[PDB]
Design a protein around this nucleic acid. Structure first.
Ligand SMILES: NCCC[C@H](N)C(=O)O
Ligand SMILES: [K+]
Ligand SMILES: [K+]
Ligand SMILES: [K+]
Ligand SMILES: [K+]
Ligand SMILES: [K+]
Ligand SMILES: [K+]
Ligand SMILES: [K+]
Ligand SMILES: [K+]
Ligand SMILES: [K+]
Ligand SMILES: [K+]
Ligand SMILES: [K+]
Ligand SMILES: [K+]
Ligand SMILES: [K+]
Ligand SMILES: [K+]
Ligand SMILES: [Mg+2]
Ligand SMILES: [Mg+2]
Ligand SMILES: [Mg+2]
Ligand SMILES: [Mg+2]
Ligand SMILES: [Mg+2]
Ligand SMILES: [Mg+2]
Ligand SMILES: [Mg+2]
Ligand SMILES: [Mg+2]
Ligand SMILES: [Mg+2]
Ligand SMILES: [Mg+2]
Ligand SMILES: [Mg+2]
Ligand SMILES: [Mg+2]
Ligand SMILES: [Mg+2]
Ligand SMILES: [Mg+2]
Ligand SMILES: [Mg+2]
Ligand SMILES: [Mg+2]
Ligand SMILES: [Mg+2]
Ligand SMILES: [Mg+2]
Ligand SMILES: [Mg+2]
Ligand SMILES: [Mg+2]
Ligand SMILES: [Mg+2]
Ligand SMILES: [Mg+2]
Ligand SMILES: [Mg+2]
Ligand SMILES: [Mg+2]
Ligand SMILES: [Mg+2]
Ligand SMILES: [Mg+2]
Ligand SMILES: [Mg+2]
Ligand SMILES: [Mg+2]
Ligand SMILES: [Mg+2]
Ligand SMILES: [Mg+2]
Ligand SMILES: [Mg+2]
Ligand SMILES: [Mg+2]
Lengths: 93, 62, 46, 77, 102, 34
RNA sequence: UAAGGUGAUAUGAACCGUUAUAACCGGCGAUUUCCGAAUGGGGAAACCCAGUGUGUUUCGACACACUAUCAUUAACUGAAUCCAUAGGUUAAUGAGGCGAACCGGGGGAACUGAAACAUCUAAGUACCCCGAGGAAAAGAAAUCAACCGAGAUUCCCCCAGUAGCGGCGAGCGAACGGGGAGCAGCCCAGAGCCUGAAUCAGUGUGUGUGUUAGUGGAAGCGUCUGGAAAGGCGCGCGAUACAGGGUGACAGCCCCGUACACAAAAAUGCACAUGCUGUGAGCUCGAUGAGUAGGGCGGGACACGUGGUAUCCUGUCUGAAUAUGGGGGGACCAUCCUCCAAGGCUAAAUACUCCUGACUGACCGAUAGUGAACCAGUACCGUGAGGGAAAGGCGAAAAGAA
RNA sequence: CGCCGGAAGACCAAGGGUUCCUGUCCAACGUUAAUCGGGGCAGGGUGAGUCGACCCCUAAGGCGAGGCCGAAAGGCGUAGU
């Protein structure tokens, strides 16, 4: 398998948007913010255990951080990974 | 703490380490959904994992 | 008209990148000089 | 390099002095030759890169005495 | 090692409120104290529509320097200075003028 | 080269501007005192 | 050590603590992603791909460890080729890279000066390279002196801009001897007796002292001016403390300190003392560093440019005598004096400061002083090496204007 | 109404890096005004067994265990990579 302490650190947050809420209504897909070095096999095994649902497939993408100018310092936000987790059609959440 | 956890052995410390990481995952989901009012709980659980992993190493490598 | 700077990231890293500087002794003295001056960018890298 | 294996001679620098005493840098090289020496103690020929003066050291000391200082130096033949 | 602490009765030695008495609300890491009814300012407070707080001329206490107050010896009725001595195992503060423990 | 100009940092070689014999409209018949 | 805390811009939120498990400071530990000598292979630095061995498994997979090169030593193997050697595999130990100056060595300019310029100068300087240490190098006379004597090396002041060298031009420039700082001598080229008798190196323990957090630390109010008193006037007190800083204007007595007196659970530097391992002192006898000294030819170093040129070093060619003997005393010979080359080790006086602490200045005060008092080697310029700024001040308190 | 239409249309590589979309603002930036913008501020947006990279294989060429050579630094090159 995997380690359960590895599982307890992969999933970070649920992502909130109009695309994230449309994907749950019509496509049966939750959108999550996951760890940056997480794999698709680690995300699938974490959702099936910590949420106790059945996952069909995981699609991931890396979001690039934006360059913001706070005052006069030119800064940059960090990158993060986003996962599209498709549940099976007998689902929950 | 740190004296109540010195009077447990390695498997009871492994049991408590997993319980602290389960609570740390549940505080993350409440804080990221705008549902956690007591934000001081995030620092407490984080530094108790550091206490348990400190004691596990000074029982094994010592 | 055609000017002198025509950018190419592969030719940039092969000519003055970090491993190109570390490959000869004279390139390693470039990095020692730039560390001694205290520069925020050592090489032309990513 | 141009180094004698027995005596340790190597190129040294000096001057070309002309009749008007113009000085130009030159080198002095050792008179190096590669030569195979018979080792009676081993029934084997050993090739060394020696100067002509280093050949006279071997003729005086013997080839086994010379090869022992070559091991003690850490030289590899 | 601090001579003026919280909840102490102090008297002001310097300024517009010189000679008045009060209790220390808190000590600050700047070397300043906030004393009740001492060093009052009027802050023109802006309104913000959260907090349910409207604006107004609010009167609050400003921090005075800690060397500008002294401990008030209630027995003598004067400003006194503070020393340190070991009664039991532990350090205490006492008044300089009569060597009595605070 | 002029490498640290603060008034014009974008340009290093500027004598095509004010030196008359280096302008693009210089003709060698201006140099007829020969 | 403590009644207050959760670093800053920088508030707020949510909390912790108040007589001791809040926070803060110090010693010893734990953790310590990836890149970088980077070391499992590769690579456009912070990335890509593995091999082997254990352990796990819900059978899909996971977790940990090891695997670079070279040198030295050992083991097992192993050709042409009979013995063998070369080579191969494995194991142990070490090295690698970085760093401001100082040190030793290997190479080594030109501008310039000569009122041109080639010998000469600049200068063995700049620079490049290798190596080492807290210092390095040198060092215990084949040295000087002068018929009297001195006594290893290094550094300082004289000797002396002298004696000399020099297109005898520009320039270069000693030694002898004298005064100081510091002071130290040994070992192998070998046997016998006596053994482990001096010394050194490592470690343990004890003692002393220092460092890495700290503790205590004296004595002032009345009045006038003023926004505010530390100032003016009046009367007191402390001082082994009137160094310094802060506080609403200039404070010995308001605060922090200062003189002085104390402090270590733990780590560590020196100073002895002692335990252990390693080392072996002393007597007699013997021995006294050979392709070397010297020479011819070509160069270089000595203040000394080949000159009448001693002495040292050696690229090349030669080549002795062995204390009944050799080296030197500035061409060379005789006499006399003095010292033993061709093996090695050695503290102090000396050089330097990237860094840490204290203190000082007829040093600077924002176009000055570091390029940089401010988020500066930044913005910006350049393919790159590299170049490189501008920019300090409300008030006592934000009381920063409801 | 006028202009391009083997482009002044469409899709990419290289290069750039959020300029994309939505809301809001108009000091400065835009050679004028601006309610607008590639400007300021906030939020959102990039979903792969089959496309591309990575990967397997090599060219020119680079590096190169041993090796050969060179005052030193280094040069060339075999097996390989
Ligand atoms: N190589 C081109 C550099 C361009 C530069 N701004 C110049 O004026 O030279
Ligand atoms: K010969
Ligand atoms: K090294
Ligand atoms: K010259
Ligand atoms: K001249
Ligand atoms: K001339
Ligand atoms: K002599
Ligand atoms: K004093
Ligand atoms: K004062
Ligand atoms: K000699
Ligand atoms: K001579
Ligand atoms: K200024
Ligand atoms: K400046
Ligand atoms: K406008
Ligand atoms: K314009
Ligand atoms: Mg799909
Ligand atoms: Mg994808
Ligand atoms: Mg960030
Ligand atoms: Mg590598
Ligand atoms: Mg690697
Ligand atoms: Mg190095
Ligand atoms: Mg050398
Ligand atoms: Mg001249
Ligand atoms: Mg010279
Ligand atoms: Mg030495
Ligand atoms: Mg104290
Ligand atoms: Mg001690
Ligand atoms: Mg002798
Ligand atoms: Mg000569
Ligand atoms: Mg001459
Ligand atoms: Mg003589
Ligand atoms: Mg004579
Ligand atoms: Mg300045
Ligand atoms: Mg000014
Ligand atoms: Mg650039
Ligand atoms: Mg400037
Ligand atoms: Mg400046
Ligand atoms: Mg038309
Ligand atoms: Mg933008
Ligand atoms: Mg747009
Ligand atoms: Mg406008
Ligand atoms: Mg637009
Ligand atoms: Mg915009
Ligand atoms: Mg913007
Ligand atoms: Mg592919
Ligand atoms: Mg090669
Ligand atoms: Mg060298």
């Amino acid at each position: 398998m995997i380690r359960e302490e590895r599982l307890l650190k992969v999933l970070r947050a649920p992502h909130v948007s109009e695309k994230a809420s449309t994907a749950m209504e019509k496509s049966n897909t939750i959108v999550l913010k996951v760890a940056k070095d997480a794999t698709k096999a680690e995300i699938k095994a974490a959702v099936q255990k910590l949420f106790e649902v059945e996952v069909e497939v995981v699609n991931t993408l890396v979001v690039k951080g934006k360059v913001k100018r706070h005052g006069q310092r030119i800064g940059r936000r960090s990158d993060w990974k986003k996962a599209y987790v498709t549940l099976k059609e007998g689902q929950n959440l | 703490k740190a004296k109540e956890l010195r009077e447990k052995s390695v498997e009871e410390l492994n049991t408590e380490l997993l319980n602290l990481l389960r609570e740390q995952f549940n505080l993350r989901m409440q804080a990221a959904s705008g549902q956690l009012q007591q934000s001081h709980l995030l620092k407490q659980v984080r530094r108790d994992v550091a206490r348990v992993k400190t004691l596990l190493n000074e029982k094994a490598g010592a | 008209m055609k000017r002198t700077f025509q950018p190419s990231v592969l030719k940039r890293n092969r000519s003055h990148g970090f491993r190109a500087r570390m490959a000869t002794k004279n390139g390693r003295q470039v990095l020692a000089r730039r560390r001694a001056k205290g520069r925020a960018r050592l090489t032309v890298s990513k | 390099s141009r180094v004698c294996q027995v005596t340790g001679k190597r190129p040294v620098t000096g001057n070309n002095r002309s009749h008007a005493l113009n000085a130009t840098k030159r080198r002095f090289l050792p008179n190096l030759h590669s030569h195979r020496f018979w080792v009676e103690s081993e029934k084997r020929f050993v090739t060394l890169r020696v100067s002509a003066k280093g050949m006279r050291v071997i003729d005086k000391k013997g080839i086994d005495t010379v090869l022992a200082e070559l091991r003690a130096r850490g030289e590899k033949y | 090692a601090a001579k003026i602490r919280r909840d102490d009765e102090v008297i002001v030695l310097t300024g517009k409120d010189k000679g008045k008495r009060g209790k220390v609300k808190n000590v600050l890491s700047s070397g300043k104290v906030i004393v009740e009814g001492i060093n009052l300012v009027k802050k023109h407070q802006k309104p913000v529509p959260a907090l349910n707080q409207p604006g107004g001329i609010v009167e609050k206490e400003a921090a005075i320097q800690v060397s500008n107050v002294a401990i008030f010896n209630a027995a003598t009725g004067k400003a006194d200075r503070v020393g340190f001595r070991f009664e039991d195992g532990k350090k205490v503060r006492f008044f300089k003028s009569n060597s009595e423990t605070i | 080269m002029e490498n640290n100009s603060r008034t014009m940092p974008h340009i290093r070689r500027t004598t095509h501007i004010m030196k008359f014999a280096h302008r693009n409209s210089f003709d060698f018949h201006f140099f007829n005192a020969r």
